[PDB]
């Protein structure tokens, strides 16, 4: 069936994502392969079929909402699974985008960061915790100026209780995980968005080493507004309880008067 519905193009960019076309309507797709031997967390669909957690998570967050990458279909194979993902065209990941432009202007960082917050909120609303929010896991739909979360491969069902496992990016991980190998989903997510926002306005992440993470001292290597500095420092509070909630972030003075995605595209992307 797969090869009957999708024309496979070349590799894109340890992960295995190929360019693809849906032969039905020539819709651009991405084809992610995951080998069963490499899967740590297994979920179960309503039908009680054993699938990778990523399928569960993508199925739970897959609706009208443009802020998360839509899982169009998936397949079981003897030794692997194959996820069909939407592919914007043209498209750039936020890592390559920040690398090319360096530090983003606050206005564009605000629009991008707002869109990421809206997307993370949607995930949380649908019982999904991403656990690997970072520039690489954000695609820019360059025409529409819309960001899309990708890679729920380290994700989990959202729970209000302690997490004692983590398979995400260390330099984006919060001090409580480094020190005590324990975190709560939302507060840890606010940490990673702190790192992300720092990365957007400074053109690089703030911390390389465990000691730097644990100390949580933030040096700005670029001119960044006082209000943006405050929001970053707040997201990056050492004590989880001291971190802002999603509501508190989106009500922060820095987050006000956000550009519409189309506005953002017109001004900053073309
Ligand atoms: N480091 C990022 C993580 C890699 C590995 N895990 C994943 O779950 C993943 C999914 C995709 C992806 C999703 C939708 C469209 C898509 O196509 C597009 F890039 F837009 F052309 C790719 C990529 C990926 C992104 C960008 C470049 C290469 C792969 N990834």
Q: Do 213 and 174 form a contact (C-beta atoms < 8 A)?
A: yes
Report the candidate in 14, 76, 86 with the shortest Cα–Cα distance to residue 49. 76
Collapsed DSSP state (helix, strand, coil) of residue 149:
strand
Q: Which residues contact 160 (CB under 8 A, 6 or more apart)?
A: 184
List Cα–Cα distances, 203 to 94, 113, 219, 235, 249, in angstroms.
11, 14, 13, 18, 21
State the DSSP code for 37.
G
Kindly state if the Cβ of 30 falls inside 6 Å of ligand 1: yes
Q: Do 120 and 180 form a contact (C-beta atoms < 8 A)?
A: no
Domain boundaries, the chain: 1-89, 90-270
Ligand 1 center from residue 150 Cα (angstroms): 7
Which sequence positions are flagged as catalytic?
A: 132
> At 236, phi and psi to the nearest 5?
-105, 20
Ligand 1 pocket test target in 11, 13, 16, 17 with most atoms within 8 Å of CB: 17
């Amino acid at each position: 069936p797969l090869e009957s519905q999708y024309q496979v193009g070349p590799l894109l960019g340890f992960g295995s994502v190929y360019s693809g076309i849906r032969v039905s309507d020539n819709l651009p797709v991405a084809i992610k392969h995951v080998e069963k031997d490499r899967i740590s967390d297994w979920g179960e669909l309503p039908n009680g079929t054993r699938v990778p957690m990523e399928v569960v998570l993508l199925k739970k967050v897959s609706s009208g909402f443009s802020g998360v990458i839509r899982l169009l279909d998936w397949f079981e194979r003897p030794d692997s699974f194959v996820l069909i993902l939407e592919r914007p065209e043209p498209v750039q990941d936020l890592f390559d985008f920040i690398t090319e432009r360096g530090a983003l202007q606050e206005e564009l960082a605000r629009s991008f960061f707002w869109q990421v917050l809206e997307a993370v909120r949607h995930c949380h609303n649908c019982g999904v915790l991403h656990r690997d929010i970072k520039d690489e896991n954000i695609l820019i739909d360059l025409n529409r100026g819309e960001l899309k979360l990708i890679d729920f491969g380290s994700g989990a069902l959202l729970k209000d209780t302690v997490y004692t496992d983590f398979d995400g990016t260390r330099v984006y991980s919060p001090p409580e995980w480094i020190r005590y190998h324990r975190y709560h989903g939302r507060s840890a997510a606010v940490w990673s968005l702190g790192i992300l926002l720092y990365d957007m306005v400074c053109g690089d992440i703030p911390f390389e080493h465990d000691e730097e993470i644990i100390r949580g001292q933030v040096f700005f290597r670029q001119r960044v507004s006082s209000e943006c500095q405050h929001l970053i420092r707040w997201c990056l509070a050492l004590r989880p309880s001291d971190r802002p909630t999603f509501e508190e972030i989106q009500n922060h003075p820095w987050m006000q008067d956000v550009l519409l995605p189309q506005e953002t595209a017109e001004i900053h992307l073309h």
